[PDB]
Design a binder for this molecule. Structure first.
Ligand SMILES: *Cc1cc2c(cc1C)nc1c(=O)[nH]c(=O)nc-1n2C[C@H](O)[C@H](O)[C@H](O)COP(=O)(O)OP(=O)(O)OC[C@H]1O[C@@H](n2cnc3c(N)ncnc32)[C@H](O)[C@@H]1O
Ligand SMILES: *Cc1cc2c(cc1C)nc1c(=O)[nH]c(=O)nc-1n2C[C@H](O)[C@H](O)[C@H](O)COP(=O)(O)OP(=O)(O)OC[C@H]1O[C@@H](n2cnc3c(N)ncnc32)[C@H](O)[C@@H]1O
Ligand SMILES: CCCCCCCCCCCC[N+](C)(C)CCCS(=O)(=O)O
Ligand SMILES: CCCCCCCCCCCC[N+](C)(C)CCCS(=O)(=O)O
Ligand SMILES: O=C(/C=C/c1ccccc1)c1cccc(C(F)(F)F)c1
Ligand SMILES: O=C(/C=C/c1ccccc1)c1cccc(C(F)(F)F)c1
Lengths: 495, 498
């Protein structure tokens, strides 16, 4: 057997961030990666047609100071997602260009309903602790309701209900009726609220890495050399003896003092445990699916949308549209012009039966309609990835909690099992579900093991991150009218 | 590599019934079983204090003709669960004895709401095909609401909402807010409806096996001899070559023409697949958890409750009660007097924090109050099993579907993946979740493979079961008034119009 101080299961950003911190503290680390590659839910494809493209996680932005710091130390640079020209909201077969992060509305009742919905998501969020959403004062009430129920209660207009549905589908790649209200409200709040989570400029989608996010995991693998084992799916963990034993599918045995599980919670199911897991984790890891998404990038000769004062951002309401959301994926130079689109949730399941060519055709036709341009019908290249297919992801972007699970099993996610500590973006308290969360969770799990070894004190397990000098955050502001305009039932009760 | 015709993964009832059918038709089978025993979600404990007790699946009843035929052929007998004396419905700290399957009400408004609740469960169920619940005309609308939402719309009284909530908790060991309305309605309909599923006499809970349900799996293991491999958890299935390779955790390798997967759907996750599963199954096996229950048996000197004209059946509403449902678990000889209780859904999680002794004390105190009996505080023995702990079950009794899953992923549950066929009670169309559904699924999967091999025609894959001559089924009947009395909203509409 191959002896070390710590085995990390998973060579995603979270596993790699963990292994780097432990290695940098002078411990011997092994990273056991199931796939022939590192990066996990990040994946950068290189070819001559795209140069590079993020088919998995891509965007970073202000307040994501851990992934920005790790990436800068690895020699990476960011560029800004194109948001110079107008965003488009496509509603009832028509494109409404706009500026500012929130699609505007003109009907005064619809205005009150939209304003109240966004404001209420943040008001509810203010009562949800980031590190313990189950301690929300209304935790059971919010957890025993789906986001569909909350939207049916909140939204007096079909316009607001359609946009709020798209918001849920886009943010967590799941249907409103699939997810806990408490969990979804936690998710938005732990990213700093509605504005921060939905924003390109001054939000989560502001920036990409030059050369792709995959370089984060690849460059940590570069530091670690053959301490990283590719095509080592972990099948068995035995804690009954003096050192922990970890076995891979190809019959290698690794012996360590500690283990970091840096995989999505449910992918714990792929490992056989001796002794059995404690009951609450044994059931928790059956209750926590990941969402459903096809990430699709269509390439063009030029970023032609810019010529009509469109930035390439499309927000597309309704059942018919295969893609509800797009961003300009063009490179900083104005070349490899591209639209990034998400096929979300049930649409990722329905449109999977089509061929690659059939999806390209559908997307090109939708883009032509929304951008009002025949150029959208002339793609030079297409790349796509269905994350629903992935045995060692289970989906993307992240794990969602169905109604009832977060209050009953949420405490279990980070709780150590003997000498196994838990990383993975799912266990983060800030931008959980993001590459930022992956770094927070890996460094924290690494530091829990340094503390178990007597190397650092308790108060250094959780560590604040200095603000990026390169990507400073601007404050989230509201207007007097946003804070004080009544809800629809507000305006009704007054009459 | 050990060569055979069919590797069966799982030696529960589903796997052992599959194995048996294949063996009887002259094929070489291997059963690979994770545990040091067969039975799975059935487990009969034997010691001198209890003689035998079912800590897992126990009850069989009329219309469950496949498990009755299999058990009869294996030499087993059934006896009747005691329902001679009165049932108890305990609500708001008081016990109301009754007779008949449904807890009665007297308040006329509350009577209309109770009758309408049960009638509407059955009305909705008749819209839902047993073999394709996602083809129900309103499948999307029903699957996109939880049973909590449905009971909030249906029940115009708290009395009905509290009884309906217990019905869900007890039937599927999950909360109303955890489960799809479509899935629950399907689950009840495929068991023959509300009356059949809740009933002791003429229903699911009518009988037990003399000596325990574990003997079904044991006696098939006896017939198969060393074809059954204990402590062989399957870790890897490879379908890239002519013959399927199945690897176990102890590095043994099995080679077959076909595999039957007879494990709970989510326990599919414990196997690494080459090539990867198709997309829809890959995601479906992360979306289908099992429920939560502790089965608890408290032993007494005598079945003292019978002397107060109580059969031992207690239906106990609300939050404080650790146990919402009990049955008499006394042996047919009238000795090893015992009460079987379920700790259901969130209570199975919450009370797992206590010691065995503390759970025994809380059950005795509850039973003392409900039965109006200090003797309930004098247990002679206690056995319990928290199925939430089992690595190779995931929970009990069975897999539930959260909102949105059965319409998106339902069709893949029993869809073959190349040379892999799916057994397990979860894949049944009649008494899915039960030992009955385990037999139907195991035999149907075996027959799918017999057809793939050209040994039987396609119209022999699905086979009806002759009705037991030993446990014949009384039909489910209603009265005119039960069929035609209005709902509460119906009565209000009449009042308006008048
Ligand atoms: C899929 C996706 C995700 C995504 C996104 C768009 C798509 C299509 N957009 C993002 C965005 O713009 N910005 C962002 O910050 N995040 C975005 N995401 C999500 C992001 O990619 C993830 O949050 C992040 O990558 C998570 O990293 P983490 O390290 O937590 O998890 P992982 O990447 O899944 O890594 C797991 C690794 O473990 C391996 N594995 C799995 N099972 C085993 C076993 N049994 N043995 C050994 N290794 C195992 C996996 O192969 C993987 O490499
Ligand atoms: C838990 C329970 C269930 C139950 C019940 C009360 C409790 C506490 N009451 C019942 C009742 O009164 N009447 C009834 O008809 N059903 C009742 N149930 C349910 C019943 O026990 C189950 O429906 C039935 O036993 C299920 O049978 P099936 O054969 O479908 O499934 P299983 O019993 O879980 O067997 C699966 C076997 O597979 C093994 N396993 C799991 N993973 C692997 C791997 N990777 N490799 C190999 N073997 C594996 C398990 O160990 C098990 O033996
Ligand atoms: C009208 N809707 C918005 C459907 C419900 C009102 C919400 S409430 O439940 O009436 O407050
Ligand atoms: C007037 C309000 C009565 C609420 C009654 N409940 C049963 C709560 C809801 C009925 C829903 S539905 O009205 O049948 O759709
Ligand atoms: O939630 C949003 C985007 C989330 C996101 C998450 C991960 C990767 C890319 C985008 C969002 C963005 C712009 C507008 C809207 C809105 F207002 F709902 F349409 C939502
Ligand atoms: O649904 C019931 C029982 C289901 C069941 C399933 C498996 C094993 C034992 C009980 C039930 C039984 C008696 C009364 C009631 C009722 F009416 F809801 F209170 C329900």
């Amino acid at each position: 057997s191959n002896k070390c101080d710590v085995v990390v299961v998973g060579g995603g950003i979270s596993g790699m961030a963990a292994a780097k911190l432990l290695h940098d503290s002078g411990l011997n680390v092994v990273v056991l990666e199931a796939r022939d590659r590192v990066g996990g839910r990040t994946y950068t494809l290189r070819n001559q047609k795209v140069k590079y493209v993020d088919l998995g996680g891509s965007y970073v932005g202000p307040t994501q100071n851990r992934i920005l710091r790790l990436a800068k130390e690895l020699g990476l640079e960011t560029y800004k997602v194109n948001e110079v020209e107008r965003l488009i909201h496509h509603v009832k077969g028509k494109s409404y260009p706009f500026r500012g992060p929130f699609p505007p509305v003109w009907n005064p009742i619809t205005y009150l309903d939209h304003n109240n919905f966004w404001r209420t998501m943040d008001d509810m969020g203010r009562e949800i602790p980031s590190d313990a959403p189950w301690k929300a004062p209304l935790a059971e009430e919010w957890d025993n309701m789906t986001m569909k129920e909350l939207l049916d209660k909140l939204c007096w207009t079909e316009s607001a209900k359609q946009l709020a549905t798209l918001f849920v589908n886009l943010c967590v790649t799941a249907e409103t009726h699939e997810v806990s209200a408490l969990w979804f409200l936690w998710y938005v709040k732990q990213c700093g609220g509605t504005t921060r989570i939905i924003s390109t400029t001054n939000g989560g989608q502001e920036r990409k890495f030059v050369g792709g996010s995959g370089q984060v995991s690849e460059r940590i693998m570069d530091l670690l050399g053959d301490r990283v084992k590719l095509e080592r799916p972990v099948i068995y963990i035995d804690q009954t003896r003096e050192n922990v034993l970890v076995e891979t599918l190809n019959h290698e045995m690794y012996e360590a003092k500690y283990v970091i599980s840096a995989i999505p919670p449910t992918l714990g199911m792929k490992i056989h445990f001796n002794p059995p897991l404690p009951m609450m984790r044994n059931q928790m890891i059956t209750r926590v699916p990941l969402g459903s998404v096809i990430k699709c990038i269509v390439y063009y000769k030029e970023p032609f949308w810019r010529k009509k004062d469109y930035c390439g951002t499309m927000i597309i309401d309704g059942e018919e549209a295969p893609v509800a959301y797009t961003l300009d994926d063009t490179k900083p130079e104005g070349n490899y012009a591209a639209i990034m689109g998400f096929i979300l949730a049930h649409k990722a399941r329905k449109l999977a039966r089509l061929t690659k060519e059939e999806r390209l055709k559908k997307l090109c036709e939708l883009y032509a309609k929304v951008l009002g341009s025949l150029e959208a019908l002339e793609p030079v290249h297409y790349e796509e990835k269905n994350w629903c297919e992935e045995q060692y992801s289970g989906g993307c972007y992240t794990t969602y909690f169905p109604p009832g699970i977060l209050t009953q099993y949420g405490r279990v996610l980070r709780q150590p099992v003997d000498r196994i500590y838990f990383a993975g973006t799912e266990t983060a308290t800030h931008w959980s579900g993001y590459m930022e969360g992956a770094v927070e969770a890996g460094e924290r799990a690494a530091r829990e093991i340094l503390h178990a070894m007597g190397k650092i004190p308790e108060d250094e397990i959780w560590q604040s991150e200095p603000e990026s000098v390169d990507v400073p955050a601007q404050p989230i502001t509201t207007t007097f009218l946003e804070r004080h305009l009544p809800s629809v039932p507000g305006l009704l009760r007054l009459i």
